[PDB]
Amino acid sequence: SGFRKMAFPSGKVEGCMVQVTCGTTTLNGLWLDDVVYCPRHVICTSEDMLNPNYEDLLIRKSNHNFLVQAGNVQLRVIGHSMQNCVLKLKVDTANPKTPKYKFVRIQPGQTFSVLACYNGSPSGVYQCAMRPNFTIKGSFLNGSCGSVGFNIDYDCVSFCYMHHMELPTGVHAGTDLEGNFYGPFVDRQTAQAAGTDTTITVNVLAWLYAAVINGDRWFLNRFTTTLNDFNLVAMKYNYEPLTQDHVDILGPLSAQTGIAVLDMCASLKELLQNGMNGRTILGSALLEDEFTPFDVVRQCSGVT
Amino acid sequence: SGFRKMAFPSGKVEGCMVQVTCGTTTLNGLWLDDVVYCPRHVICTSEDMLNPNYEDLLIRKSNHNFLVQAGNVQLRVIGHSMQNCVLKLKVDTANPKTPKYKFVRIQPGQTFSVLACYNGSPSGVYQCAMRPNFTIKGSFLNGSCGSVGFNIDYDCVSFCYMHHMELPTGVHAGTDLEGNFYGPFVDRQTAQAAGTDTTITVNVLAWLYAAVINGDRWFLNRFTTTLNDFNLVAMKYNYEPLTQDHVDILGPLSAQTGIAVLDMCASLKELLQNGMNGRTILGSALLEDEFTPFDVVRQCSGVT
Ligand SMILES: Cc1ccncc1NC(=O)C1(c2cccc(Cl)c2)CC(=O)C1
Ligand SMILES: Cc1ccncc1NC(=O)C1(c2cccc(Cl)c2)CC(=O)C1
């Protein structure tokens, strides 16, 4: 009973958080095995961020300029390299708390947990999604850079995000763990605007299935629709077009509830056209799109 | 930038989760030092839950009947006692991962994180609040009993909740770590109804302050009100009466934003009377009441 925006337990990631300082700049790093990963803008001053030439700024840095502190102990830096927008600092000690891990580059619409950190110390954990415009709506302040996003499959942590910057609109941009930005963003203090923040339709449908499973059924109607008809409505409301791949992923939720995917689409169509009329679904007064079909199955089954 | 429903990092609590089995019943326990805490209904069968006499059911249980497994290793049970609605199982090994901890009994309106577990294994973490009717709106399935709620002050974990049951309405009831239920609930499979779920006014005001800090300012108006005038409106909308104690706790948010508490009350009054008119505040289409003033200060300052 009940349905909450749930994050993965963060212990495995907390054991990886370190502080990296280079000059006067301090941010977070991720220590896995004998490598510390962090945003390359750790080498920049505030003046440097306007138009940084990272290769040139890195020439003036040596291993001893990167101060890496794990809790209260100093790690010895024996190598450093830049991979895209991340720095990889080779340290002389493998992290004893390194979990089983993978680096994955996620797709827009996919959700993950973020362990927000400051000075190598965790402050909180929350769940969010890679928006279709490749931004994330997080909660990050100055010093949170290097905080990571991840998913967990039993014992394996799949790292998918490293926080780099806030856009002038207060939305967030970052990279995968190979240092490649999600979307078109660059690690420079230049105004970069985000595209249309469309709604992740397959996630809204999954959340409607979670609502039915939990007793919120008022929105179920006597209608059905087709993918093409549904998609005309989706376009009108800045919703992602629904494909047969999305219908397929909703199959287990359709099977569990006995509500055909296209019938749930017709319920969603009426909600788009008519609004909620002052009513709520799973305690929300808007259509939630940051639960994937996998998240709904996981939460509704009790996977650990 | 950004404001999210953030839970505390759960690592310190994950290191305390164990599985307790008694007969055919398995639930979660909390292992701190050489004691494992768990709901006393672990000794019950499904037949026993209709009208259990816990003292009598406990006479037929010995130390060896409580199977406690920490990850994949068995703990030796050398003592057992019942304190209110919890069992305390003395084990022969102190938990090496025991964090600095306290047991606190929270007040309605206070928020905390829950580490939902199944079979001693963490599945997720979410933030919630003790409702004014002493229920919590969680996400718990069969086997989640013994999952705990907590807050963290730097290195000290303050345990405040242990999950025991779901009401027939899908809301949740549990105890503090001394085994005393929050509210009037009893650990028995008898239909128990929850009282009025009123809105935590001081939390809604704190969340309005977080909204102003983050740029969502449309709801600020040219009005002010008094505590008594505000409270007539609060009563009409099933909001908790606001007291001078609540105004005092909002002082730092008032000081940071320059918006007097009673002016924020007048903005809240207009939102109650007029609704949001299809608009959102911090991505929500309703007034959020599960952030305390302390949570807002903490999140907006970056406390680790
Ligand atoms: C202030 C803040 C809040 C939330 N999330 C991140 C930041 N930091 C930034 O955005 C900064 C930055 C500026 C341009 C490019 C890049 Cl890569 C980084 C300005 C710094 O200091 C780093
Ligand atoms: C099924 C579920 C979902 C979420 N949270 C808890 C539960 N479990 C219960 O409520 C059960 C129960 C019943 C009456 C009293 C008490 Cl103390 C416990 C029925 C069990 O099995 C334990």
Curated annotation (Swiss-Prot), chains A, B:
Residues 1-304 are cytoplasmic. Residues 1-304 form the Peptidase C30 domain. It is found in: Host cytoplasm; Host Golgi apparatus; Host nucleus. It catalyses: TSAVLQ-|-SGFRK-NH2 and SGVTFQ-|-GKFKK the two peptides corresponding to the two self-cleavage sites of the SARS 3C-like proteinase are the two most reactive peptide substrates. The enzyme exhibits a strong preference for substrates containing Gln at P1 position and Leu at P2 position. Inhibited by pyridone-containing alpha-ketoamides compounds 13a and 13b. In turn, alpha-ketoamide 13b (tert-butyl (1-((S)-1-(((S)-4-(benzylamino)-3,4-dioxo-1-((S)-2-oxopyrrolidin-3-yl)butan-2-yl)amino)-3-cyclopropyl-1-oxopropan-2-yl)-2-oxo-1,2-dihydropyridin-3-yl)carbamate) inhibits SARS-CoV-2 replication in human lung cells. Inhibited ex vivo by michael acceptor inhibitor N3. Inhibited ex vivo by compound 11a and 11b. Changing residue 142 to A: Does not affect ability to cleave and inactivate human TRMT1. The active site is at residues 41, 145. It comes from the Viruses. Cleaves the C-terminus of replicase polyprotein at 11 sites. Recognizes substrates containing the core sequence [ILMVF]-Q-|-[SGACN]. Cleaves and inactivates human TRMT1, preventing tRNA guanine(26)-dimethylation of tRNAs. May cleave human NLRP1 in lung epithelial cells, thereby activating the NLRP1 inflammasome pathway. May cleave human GSDMD, triggering alternative GSDME-mediated epithelial cell death upon activation of the NLRP1 inflammasome, which may enhance the release interleukins 1B, 6, 16 and 18. Also able to bind an ADP-ribose-1''-phosphate (ADRP). 3CL-PRO exists as monomer and homodimer. Only the homodimer shows catalytic activity. Interacts with host FBXO22; this interaction promotes the proteasomal degradation of nsp5. This is 3C-like proteinase nsp5. It comes from Severe acute respiratory syndrome coronavirus 2 (2019-nCoV). The chain holds residues 3264 to 3567 of 7096 of the full protein.
